[PDB]
Amino acid sequence: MGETVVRDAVTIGKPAEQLYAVWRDLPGLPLLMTHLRSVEVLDDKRSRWTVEAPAPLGAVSWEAELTADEPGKRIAWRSLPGARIENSGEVLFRPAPGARGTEVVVRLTYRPPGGSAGAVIARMFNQEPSQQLRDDLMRFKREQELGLEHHHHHH
Numbered sequence: 001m002g003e004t005v006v007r008d009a010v011t012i013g014k015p016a017e018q019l020y021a022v023w024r025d026l027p028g029l030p031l032l033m034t035h036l037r038s039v040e041v042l043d044d045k046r047s048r049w050t051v052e053a054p055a056p057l058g059a060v061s062w063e064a065e066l067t068a069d070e071p072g073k074r075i076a077w078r079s080l081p082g083a084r085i086e087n088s089g090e091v092l093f094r095p096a097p098g099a100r101g102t103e104v105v106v107r108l109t110y111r112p113p114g115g116s117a118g119a120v121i122a123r124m125f126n127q128e129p130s131q132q133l134r135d136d137l138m139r140f141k142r143e144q145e146l147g148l149e150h151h152h153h154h155h
Contacts, residue, residue, distance in 0.1 A: 005109035008134045010141035013101040016072035016093035022144050028153035042066070045077060057082030112136070
């Protein structure tokens with residue numbers, strides 16, 4: 001219908017790790033990094049917590065993996081050859097100009113909101129002088145900079 005691949009970048013006061021982690025509740029499992037990981041469970045984009053099954057997708061028919069993960073370089077989302085990801089987008093991280101934080105440059109295709117009026121309501125008092133462009137991605141920045149939890153993640 002109107003699936004648009006928008007390329008823009010938002011700046012939030014988070015290093016990088018928590019920026020791509022925006023798809024989660026800001027997790028804190030530094031145990032599952034590098035090699036020697038048995039628990040390939042993240043739940044972020046789904047996962048199917050099998051751990052034992054051969055291949056990340058060679059069992060559960062529909063599963064999700066993240067094909068790229070770097071501490072602060074670029075992260076590309078995936079959904080494994082089992083489920084076959086419909087979406088596409090690799091997020092890159094660079095230090096924002098003026099030291100305003102980190103700017104996440106994303107080129108991703110997605111479906112647009114039907115009601116654009118939902119954005120303009122914020123103009124009543126938004127306190128966000130971020131131009132009359134990139135409307136859809138601006139609310140994303142707002143919610144990312146708003147969301148903050150313990151770095152260990154406490155639930």
